[PDB]
Design a protein around this ligand. Sequence first.
Ligand SMILES: [Mg+2]
Ligand SMILES: [Mg+2]
Lengths: 226, 226, 225, 225
Amino acid sequence: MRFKDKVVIVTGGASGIGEATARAFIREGAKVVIADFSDALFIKTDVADTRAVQALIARTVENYGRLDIMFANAGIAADAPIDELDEAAWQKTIDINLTGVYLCDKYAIDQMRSQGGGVIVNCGSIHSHVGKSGVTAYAAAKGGVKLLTQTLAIDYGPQNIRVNAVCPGYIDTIPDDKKQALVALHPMGRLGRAEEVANAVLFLASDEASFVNGASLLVDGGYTAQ
Amino acid sequence: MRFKDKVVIVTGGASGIGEATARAFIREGAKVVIADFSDALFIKTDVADTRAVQALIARTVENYGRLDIMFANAGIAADAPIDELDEAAWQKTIDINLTGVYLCDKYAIDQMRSQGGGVIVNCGSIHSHVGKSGVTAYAAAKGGVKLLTQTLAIDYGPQNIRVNAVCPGYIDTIPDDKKQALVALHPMGRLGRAEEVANAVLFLASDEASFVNGASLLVDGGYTAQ
Amino acid sequence: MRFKDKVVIVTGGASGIGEATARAFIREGAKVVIADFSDALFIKTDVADTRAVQALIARTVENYGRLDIMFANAGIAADAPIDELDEAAWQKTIDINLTGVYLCDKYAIDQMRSQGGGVIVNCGSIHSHVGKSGVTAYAAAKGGVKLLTQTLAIDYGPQNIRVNAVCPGYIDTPDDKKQALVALHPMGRLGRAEEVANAVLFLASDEASFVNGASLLVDGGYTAQ
Amino acid sequence: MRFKDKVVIVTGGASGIGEATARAFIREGAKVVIADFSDALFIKTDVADTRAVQALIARTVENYGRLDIMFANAGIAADAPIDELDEAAWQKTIDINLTGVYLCDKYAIDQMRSQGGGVIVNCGSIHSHVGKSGVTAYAAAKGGVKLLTQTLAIDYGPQNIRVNAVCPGYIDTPDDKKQALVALHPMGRLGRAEEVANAVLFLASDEASFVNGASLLVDGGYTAQ
Ligand SMILES: [Mg+2]
Ligand SMILES: [Mg+2]
């Protein structure tokens, strides 16, 4: 149990990668707060809303006395090629997938600086690195997450805070032919599992990654290698 | 004169890189529309405002009959380390430097698809690639611009549209010691000139770059090489 | 105890990162073969010599039955700006740091294909990604290791083999030169060999079961700026 | 006419990209020396042989007085998945595609330093950035060329030399194999040698006066996805 009594916030924690990661942190002894739009302690939070994010962190600290680890993972996938992507759809993805990471990072960092250290893992993507047809707002957001991660690592690295991104390929959580086409882009010959992303998050959040800072860890079966 | 009678929009065109680029396109025979918040045809445009962007492109087409080249360059630099960066400052940079590029790209692409082709150059940055202390919102925005550029190249590449990013280092356009510290990060031993960025933009916008698509062209004296 | 009875080769195993990595694998239950130019079973091996590399792998398989994990880590640092870098110095770095990785990877992959799977961790560097003054042959070698890692991941990913690279920053293993190196790492210190070992064990483990073709930077922020 | 009386060497100059590049430089007023294993002055040169490379550069300087631009482009494509890639095939690709670039760059830089400046364009590849099935030695070589380019830009950038890499996708120079390659390029066709030449001339020109240490992809979108 590598996370005994560590206080962890997982955003987007009610499903998929977030749920697998919260479950893994609980298994390893952490005190976990799950934040999501809807249903470990659950706290409803719109990560695009600064007051809700501040309240999330404040409540966590009031309940447990500290915040050790933030996994800023909330995100939507609701996208289109640009000619079909309307402004409200673009903005919703930027709000949640990029601004939400800024907000969660900002208020986690304030708390961690007051403690003399902490660890952040941001949810990036293969699409922090490469684009794809129809993946317009999501790629833009995830590219921003990568760069945000890097600047934070530079500013807060010297202050005993590490900030890294996990960058998943496609995860099994659609038409058969659409699914086989996705599979064909991953050299390992299958999609990932959510627990496989969780495992990487726990590595980055742990002292096993004590000199890993500002890095993107691709969990993508080889997708970005080609 | 490589751009005789080509219709070009330059956003952020009233100063710095935008002004140098507009001037270069005019010298090479283009019909240029300069768009900026304030004072070639000038059209006041808030690039964060979808109706103003639509009107910019509509007016350009009404005046000149077509749009051949868009340089989506508007941007602000008004930033801080995250602990000092308030939400309104973050949002203003995301709005202008990222959403403004989406808007300009979106409505340029609609016009170019109706013509059977065109060329976009987006203004990226060294900070599409690397972070820097205190460069929080700007890095996030520019990282997003890079990825947006890549997806557009993938979606619209097959439709005779090329989309690339120019990625400048620091350009001479501050305390002496701050300036020498910036200079020290550029292996060529000086900051760039705006006309040097313009030259790259014209290359990417030209048929000399006819198989260049989805690419970032670093104009940074070596900054990102180390 | 993530590596109980797993058979591991660590090249460059007699010092620094290789030494720490072998010790870490031993702690976690592995049967470890250490390979190096000179002094866990130790087998003296010149990684630039194909007959030696083949013999290393054959002897590991003869002793322990199989080869689960290869950490291809041997490497020299003896470099110069190009105007001062002699052809023999260039060649020696390429031979050990790049061709040595090809050879170790090639013959590990033959065994891994035969036995139905396995895992390779190549030792890259920050200099798989960024150059630096006076780091000419070593950067070329490490850039090569990164791309080699990627192609291998693509070819052998479908064959139950994963191939990844660990990419260390500067590791503490002339005060003013040291402080200059430290100033390039945002975390404010050089890395430890043990920290690189930790990353190797992650990449070699079933915790990294969908990590393939990746470079994991262990650099305190060096490449982030 | 951007290159009036500029002295240029193009290695691998007898065909494809090298040929197109030399022709483009000649159109624009340059004095061009073409170097290749066999057939603008032509000088037969094995780029993997240091004496030959030194002789190439010396003869260019003796004939024309100086060396303004080096396009280090020689390169072979003869590769295989690692399990099929013999040591001699690996070595030949490394020798020509990586060590050849080191040698051309080294002796160009000596001349350029002596004369007070100059410009180098190295031929990288999409495979300086991404791997591909069966592209083992060539990807390693090209990854090496990218990092070599970066270190050179750092060391020699302050000395009025710029060093950059052009990185072509597949260039049209077995229908089903061709269509598969084409499907990987979003623009819907393979590139032309002339399109790579255009990028070389840009990077070699004063239009690229602040471009240093960069890789310019000429790939129709290949690496973007
Ligand atoms: Mg790709
Ligand atoms: Mg850097």
